Amino acid sequence: DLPTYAFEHRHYWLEPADPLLGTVVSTPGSDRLTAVAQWSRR
Amino acid sequence: AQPWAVDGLVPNAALVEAAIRLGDLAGTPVVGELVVDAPVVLPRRGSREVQLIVGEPGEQRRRPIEVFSREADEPWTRHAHGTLAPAAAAVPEPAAAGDATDVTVAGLRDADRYGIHPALLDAAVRTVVGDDLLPSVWTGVSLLASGATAVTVTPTATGLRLTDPAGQPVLTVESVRGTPFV
């Protein structure tokens, strides 16, 4: 019983990748508030 | 999100790279000057909201840049500040004032997402500034090549030259200086 082939190995992998107001942000140290959103017909 | 951040403590190299990317968005590949007010220590549980605010340009198109971080309702503590200067047409590389160091860091995940991986950048800057002193005054950071994996550091009097093993320059720091951080 002889040993089998010696395969060279390298790693390979592939990991997977408010409706209207969206994201609300407060400016650091300021009372101004920004709501950012994206709107489409669908 | 940042597994390379040792015990959540973020090396200043990652902040420098983030500032580099922000300048690239603003068309400012060169950092005129950065002084680190305080390092970032990510909480073991949870995350921290990090903001990098670049103010309106003044003289020589240079834009003020500051970093404010807050953990949930935390007060906005400034981590680093300074100004970003437009890249010079010809950057004069300072002479070789340090012996060449072929810095290699294993597990540079998302190293393509940066010009240089933050772990690799931190190791390279520790090979020049010194391990015990955290480099916090970074002047004239000029980026040329992106996606470096194993870097060749030619240290200068206060900065360094980061090149590929082939010798093509990748980055230059005019003056990087370490300060006692505990």
Q: Could you write out the DSSP letters of every residue in B85-106? A: EPPPSS--PPP--S--EEEE-S
**What distance in Å separates residue A20's CA from the closest CA in chain B?**
23
C-alpha–C-alpha distance, residues B119 and B25, integer Å: 23
What value, to the nearest 5°, has the Cα angle with vertex B14 and ends B39 and B59?
A: 85
Give the dihedral sign, CA B18/B24/B25/B26: positive
Give dist(CA B57, CA B68) in Å, integer: 19
**How far is Cα A15 from Cα B110, in angstroms, rounded to an integer?**
13
- The resolution in Å comes to 4.0
Nearest Cα neighbor of B120 from B136, B107, B133 is B107
- The number of residues making up chain A comes to 42
d(CA B98, CA B162): 12
Contacts with A29 from chain B: Cβ below 8 Å: 76
Token readout for B116 is: 């240089």
The helix/strand/coil state of B12 is: helix
Residue B114 Cα distances to A21, B27, B168, angstroms: 32, 16, 18
CB neighbours (10 Å) of residue B176? Answer: 24
* Pairwise CA distance, residues B111 & B57, whole Å: 30
Q: How far is residue B46's CA from residue B89's CA, in Å, rounded to a whole number?
A: 44
**Does residue B122 sit in helix, strand or coil?**
helix
Write down the residue that tokens 């230059």 correspond to.
B172
How far off is chain A from B93, nearest CA to CA, in Å? 38
- Token pair 């007060």 in the structure block, residue: B75
Chain B residues lying within 8 Å of A28, measured CB to CB? 51, 53, 68, 70, 76
C-beta atoms of B70 and A29 within 8 A: no
Distance CA B59, CA B85 (A): 9
How far CA B20 is from CA of A16, B13, B39, B104, B177, in Å, comes to 28, 10, 17, 21, 18
Residues β-bridged to residue B120: none
Q: Classify burial at B91, counting beta carbons within 10 Å of its beta carbon; exposed 0-12, middle 13-18, buried 19 or more.
A: middle
Four-point Cα dihedral B61, B62, B63, B64, nearest 10: -150
Asked whether B122 and B11 are in contact (CB, 8 A), the reply is yes
Residue A29 to residue B51, Cβ atoms within 8 A: no
Name the one residue in this structure whose structure tokens are 């010009």.
B115
Rounded to whole angstroms, the Cα distance separating B51 from B66 reads 8
Radius of gyration of chain A (CA): 27
Contact B150, B124 (CB under 8 A): no
* A7, B39, B67 from B181: Cα distances, Å: 47, 9, 18
- What's the helix, strand, coil split of chain A in %, to 5? 0, 20, 80
Method in brief: cryo-EM
Set of chain A residues whose Cβ sits within 8 Å of the Cβ of B76:
28-29
Distance of CA A41 to the CA centre of its chain: 25
Q: At what angle do helices B12-25 and B118-126 cross, to 10 degrees?
A: 120
Residues 6+ apart with CB under 8 A from B111: B117, B120, B147, B148, B149
Chain B partners within 8 Å of A11 (Cβ): none
